[PDB]
Design a binder for this molecule. Structure first.
Ligand code: MH0
Ligand code: MH0
Ligand SMILES: *[C@@H]1O[C@H](CO)[C@@H](O[C@@H]2O[C@H](CO)[C@@H](O[C@@H]3O[C@H](CO)[C@@H](O)[C@H](O)[C@@H]3O)[C@H](O)[C@H]2NC(C)=O)[C@H](O)[C@H]1NC(C)=O
Ligand SMILES: *[C@@H]1O[C@H](CO)[C@@H](O[C@@H]2O[C@H](CO)[C@@H](O[C@@H]3O[C@H](CO)[C@@H](O)[C@H](O)[C@@H]3O)[C@H](O)[C@H]2NC(C)=O)[C@H](O)[C@H]1NC(C)=O
Ligand SMILES: *[C@@H]1O[C@H](CO)[C@@H](O)[C@H](O)[C@H]1NC(C)=O
Ligand SMILES: *[C@@H]1O[C@H](CO)[C@@H](O)[C@H](O)[C@H]1NC(C)=O
Ligand SMILES: *[C@@H]1O[C@H](CO)[C@@H](O)[C@H](O)[C@H]1NC(C)=O
Ligand SMILES: *[C@@H]1O[C@H](CO)[C@@H](O)[C@H](O)[C@H]1NC(C)=O
Ligand SMILES: *[C@@H]1O[C@H](CO)[C@@H](O)[C@H](O)[C@H]1NC(C)=O
Ligand SMILES: *[C@@H]1O[C@H](CO)[C@@H](O)[C@H](O)[C@H]1NC(C)=O
Ligand SMILES: [Ca+2]
Ligand SMILES: [Ca+2]
Ligand SMILES: [Cl-]
Lengths: 595, 595
């Protein structure tokens, strides 16, 4: 295969330096080095790649070959013996709403994507991998360990394809494999607008001069907009219920329809851009399509940044917030804005916050219809449950009123994700997200737990007792040692997520470090950061401070009661207030008379 | 596809319908369909695109793949074996001045521009294409044939970048790839004023309310104006002589400084707008900056149209003039005003009319200084030879008194263009304009010779003997067959230009058809055509008939003696008369009292 040898800039660079707007592609943000943070480039490395053969082959590729002396345990064996649990009772997070989980995934999709090597080329090398479990080239199968229930049910393996990667480049230098980030490293609403101008154009209402995003023309949510349907086949959203035959939504990000609440959040964000465009049309009738789009885009861009840094990261990082993301001291153009390879695994802490069910709630936040509570696994690539069952309002009430799953050392990932995950190109609700994470760490040539512990100036346990100490759990440490033999070999994803959460936070000290560092860098290293002088007026920045997720819902649904702080656990009706009481985004400071 | 929806970048501006002036962008000319003829749209297709893969990839992309059975020959091999010649003796056109050549290029640049995917000169992918000759994406290298002298001197290839294309500006294809026309399809002096309002504003003297175009403030031509300097770096005009360090001129068209006589013609046109503005200021003191600019612009607009249709096209099309451009029957709003893809190659007949030298002539039309006669290749992106060596007057005398090169089946393109062309982003006087033309036909998915022969209801030869008959040349036909194998595969540019010229014209029957059709359409389809009732008064149209290139020179240089008809071969002194004897543009009919 060797898909994408390189990698050279598909969209090139057109650095119009007097432009006050971000490029779609993230190009020209850093003037010294224009390609920093741009889409379809190599993920940054904070540490060098670690491969079996020093180059491309992941640890666990060759049966014989070991890692610091010891064999690497099968991903799925780690999943079963550490990450699995049966009893969904008492697992919910008492002080975080489901929106906490959902916003994590929205942010993640803005920041990074490392899609599978793109070509089958009308080929059965896709099925050759899946059907016959033959390791080779980009087929890197997850092998089931002995006694795995799925041996009886699914055969020898789950299929897995290695992430795409950059050049054999003209020097043809001996180089480590570097995975591509297909989206813009900047927090810039790229999941709404796209990370490539082909898509970004295709997503716009251009037949109208109002700088509107294209909306669905086949269905409506009580007069409120849905995303257009992706009519490209084969559609996995139609596959999951062939009777309903409802396609996936077309969005700025490839993964928008991956699960119903993600599609829902994508719907809120789209409605908000169009709401901003027709409000700026009233204030500035002389402004043309491009100007409305770009200003709406810039505002939405800043909304995501503010909600992320003011509301979201403080409750992720807790006691470590000020240590890693201090108060803002302005655009430092020598900071690397690019998303690191390791961050893409660090931010998968989200996977342990996803509970087993999604609720639809009515206008009194009571169960909506007969089947209010749906198991998560039925909502993978599910657009019909939106179009043909009540719109997004009942789902949005669910996000405010239901709880995220709490990370728990004895109950890590729900079987809805660990056993019943649906992958868009395969036929079965039978995959393991946790196994995929461990396999993917290896694919990406991830350094081990201690390598990253070291990188964060934290202790590097070499012993059962030393690990017991860091994890504050004897049975967990013992299980990890039985499988990995050394904490050096522990795959970063399970290692970071094994660490007890920090005070007032929702991740361990190691992930706090890794997340904190990256979030500091995408702020400080962003020339279009919202707080950077000259991006917005002082007037505009005063008005942008009032924004809230609560207000987003009010302005873009038919929901009237919302809580003041949407990310904390809020029960109806005590913790809810009327939409009329919530501060608004006053757009007066955008009013451009005598232009 | 996104078909019926596909749209690329554009300013998306609305229509002030009561405006009596052209938009900068060509928007709102056609009221039914406002975008027709506007800048930064798809070139029209008269026949469907023909690509290797039916979509985007040009014929000659894949070494393997063939065209109607036969492989397509390397562009450079066609250049060397057909288009080249050594002997510049007797090649001059004895009945056309050099202004004939120069006016062609001026008109061309008003009408169409399909710029390369714009490289920022900040990437390794620019040099990756140039240095390693690696075909991929927008790098489509011109490969040297074996025994080509440039192998020893320049490596394996000339670099070549594919023209930009619509909706997706990076690669996505389901409908055929359509190249952009970055200028206004209307004959409207857009090369003076710009095809985009950011530029058009930036080119004006706005700090004075006299509707003047900005002029050079660093240098003067015996008190007469030069265009401002293009401050954008790196400047290729200062690259060609780093001691002189003289930048390229800033004009309405990107290509103004491509060669010294083009820059010269751009200088005359600019001086004439300013001369019109300060004459209309005298006649109408109450008129403001906008009104002076727009009326000056409208007059100059009409000048170019009249010289083109009354003087230029008759001597291009000869016997075919009346057939294709009959007498004017008024604005037909159902005619397509857009420039076709194929026209942009048809109008490159100009390339075979460019002679090997440019002369500076003194006040007696004698050699000016010791180095009067300069080889053409030294005058690519050459502004210093104007600023620091005599101004434009000696060069303008050259245009009147020297001859255009004659198209010749045995002597097609001078080595000045065929071996020694300079490209603005590269370092060497080493490119081949003919090779680039053949490569560019393929890039633009051009149908073959016979496809266009057919489109013009002319015979479609399938044999050596049949081709010999059409070309009235045995050795040319034989060479074409040895390379292309079928006349079906012959690239439109070399095919049209191979055809013996029509009676008292300067192109063959095929180009007569293609040029004639397009010129008919940009007249008939233009709502602001100068002869269209209501654009000008009957009085104004009577005064506009007197204009001449001879008069333009008189009013805008320090030249005193000029011929009555500048496009014919005119020798000093018999055919020259005094400037006082030439009919003037009487601007009395623009006098607008009591407004
Ligand atoms: C708060 C963060 C977060 C949340 C919540 C989250 C929630 C979910 N996830 Fe998942 N997810 C998160 C962060 C990621 C990241 C960072 C990546 C890696 C992306 C990349 O390629 O760079 C990821 N998730 C990657 C994935 C992948 C791809 C795995 C691979 O091939 O390696 C899948 C299938 C996926 N998720 C599913 C889901 C589903 C389903 C949900 C919820 C129902
Ligand atoms: C009578 C017409 C005419 C004349 C004379 C003429 C004279 C010249 N030329 Fe050239 N040229 C003419 C008509 C064109 C056209 C129509 C185009 C295509 C433009 C477009 O993008 O739509 C063109 N020339 C395009 C070009 C290009 C771009 C080629 C490519 O990349 O595909 C170059 C470099 C160029 N010329 C050089 C020159 C030079 C140098 C001279 C004279 C000194
Ligand atoms: C692109 O934008 C244009 C307008 O900016 C959209 O066309 C507009 O579509 C709306 C429907 O969304 C139309 O309004 C409708 O009027 C009927 C008739 O009374 C009513 O049944 C509906 O409730 C609705 O109000 C409207 O005709 C039309 N506006 C204009 C100016 O044409 C177009 O749909 C957008 N396209 C995309 C892809 O988003
Ligand atoms: C040299 O160039 C000039 C181009 O202007 C040519 O002179 C012109 O020749 C044309 C033929 O295409 C003559 O057209 C004729 O016009 C008269 C009108 O009185 C008409 O009776 C004829 O039917 C014909 O249409 C034109 O008179 C003549 N013009 C001038 C000013 O001399 C000439 O043909 C070229 N010579 C060569 C050898 O190519
Ligand atoms: C939940 O967290 C919020 C802010 O993170 C805090 O103000 C509140 O006291 C906490 N409440 C509970 C019940 O944990
Ligand atoms: C599929 O869709 C129909 C309505 O479109 C619905 O009644 C049915 O319950 C769905 N089937 C499943 C498996 O959920
Ligand atoms: C920018 O960040 C670097 C660390 O990469 C730091 O050394 C430097 O002090 C910062 N620059 C400024 C001006 O604060
Ligand atoms: C503006 O107008 C004045 C007088 O008309 C003139 O001196 C000046 O050169 C113009 N400005 C520019 C930049 O050309
Ligand atoms: C370069 O420019 C200078 C004027 O600055 C001129 O005298 C000299 O002859 C030029 N040299 C070349 C090599 O063109
Ligand atoms: C106007 O345009 C159409 C060609 O598209 C043609 O059918 C019609 O005859 C034209 N009218 C005139 C007067 O040429
Ligand atoms: Ca982004
Ligand atoms: Ca034009
Ligand atoms: Cl065409």
């Amino acid at each position: 295969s060797w898909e994408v040898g390189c990698g050279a800039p598909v969209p090139l660079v057109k650095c119009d330096e007097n432009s006050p707007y971000r490029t779609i592609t993230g190009d020209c943000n850093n003037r010294r080095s224009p390609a920093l943070g741009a889409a379809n480039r190599a993920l940054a490395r904070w540490l060098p790649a670690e491969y079996e053969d020093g180059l491309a082959l992941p640890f666990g590729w060759t049966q014989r070959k070991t890692r610091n002396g010891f064999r690497v345990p099968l991903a799925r064996e780690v999943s079963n013996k550490i990450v699995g649990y049966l009893d969904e009772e008492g697992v919910l997070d008492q002080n975080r709403s489901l929106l906490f989980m959902q916003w994590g995934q929205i942010v993640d999709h803005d920041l990074d994507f490392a899609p599978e090597t793109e070509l089958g080329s009308n080929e059965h090398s896709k099925t050759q991998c899946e059907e016959y479990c033959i390791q080779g080239d980009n087929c890197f199968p997850i092998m089931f360990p002995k006694n795995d229930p799925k041996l009886k049910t699914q055969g020898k393996c789950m299929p897995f394809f290695r992430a795409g990667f950059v050049c054999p480049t003209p020097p043809y230098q001996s180089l480590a494999r570097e995975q591509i980030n297909a989206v813009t490293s900047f927090l810039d609403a790229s999941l709404v607008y796209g990370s490539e101008p082909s898509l970004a154009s295709r997503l716009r209402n251009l037949s109208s001069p109002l700088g509107l995003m294209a909306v669905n023309q086949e269905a409506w949510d009580h007069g409120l907009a849905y995303l257009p349907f992706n009519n490209k086949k084969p559609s996995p959203c139609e596959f999951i219920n062939t009777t309903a035959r409802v396609p996936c939504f077309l969005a700025g990000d490839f993964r928008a329809s991956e699960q119903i609440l993600l599609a829902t959040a994508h719907t809120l964000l789209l409605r908000e851009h169009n709401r901003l465009a027709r409000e700026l049309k009233k204030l500035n009738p002389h402004w043309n399509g491009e100007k409305l789009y770009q200003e709406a885009r810039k505002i939405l861009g800043a909304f995501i940044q503010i909600i992320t840094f003011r509301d979201y990261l403080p409750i992720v990082l807790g006691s470590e917030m000020q240590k890693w993301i201090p108060p803002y001291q302005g655009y430092n153009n020598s900071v690397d804005p690019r998303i690191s390879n390791v961050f893409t695994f660090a931010f998968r802490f989200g996977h342990m916050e996803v509970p087993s069910t999604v609720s639809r709630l009515d206008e009194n936040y009571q169960p909506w219809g007969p089947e209010a509570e749906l198991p998560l696994h039925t909502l993978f690539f599910n657009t019909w449950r939106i179009i043909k069952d009540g719109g997004i309002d009942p789902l949005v009430r669910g996000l405010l009123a239901k709880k995220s799953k709490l990370m728990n050392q004895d109950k890590m990932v729900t079987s809805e994700l660990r056993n019943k995950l649906f992958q868009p190109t395969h036929k079965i609700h039978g995959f393991d997200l946790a196994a995929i994470n461990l396999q993917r760490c290896r694919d990406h040539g991830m350094p081990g737990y201690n390598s990253w512990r070291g990188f964060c100036g934290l202790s590097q346990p070499k012993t059962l007792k030393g690990l017991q100490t860091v994890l504050k759990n004897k049975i967990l440490a013992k299980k990890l040692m039985d499988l990995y033999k050394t904490p050096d070999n522990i795959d970063i994803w399970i290692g970071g997520n094994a660490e007890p959460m920090v005070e007032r936070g929702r991740v361990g000290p190691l992930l706090a470090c890794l997340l904190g560092r990256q979030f500091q860098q995408i702020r400080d290293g962003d020339r279009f950061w919202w707080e950077n002088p000259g991006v917005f007026t002082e007037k505009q920045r005063d008005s942008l401070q009032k924004v809230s997720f609560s207000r987003l819902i009010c302005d873009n649904t038919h929901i009237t009661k919302v809580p003041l702080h949407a990310f904390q656990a809020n029960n109806y009706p005590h913790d809810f207030v009327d939409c009329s009481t919530v501060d608004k985004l006053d757009l007066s400071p955008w009013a451009s008379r005598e232009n």
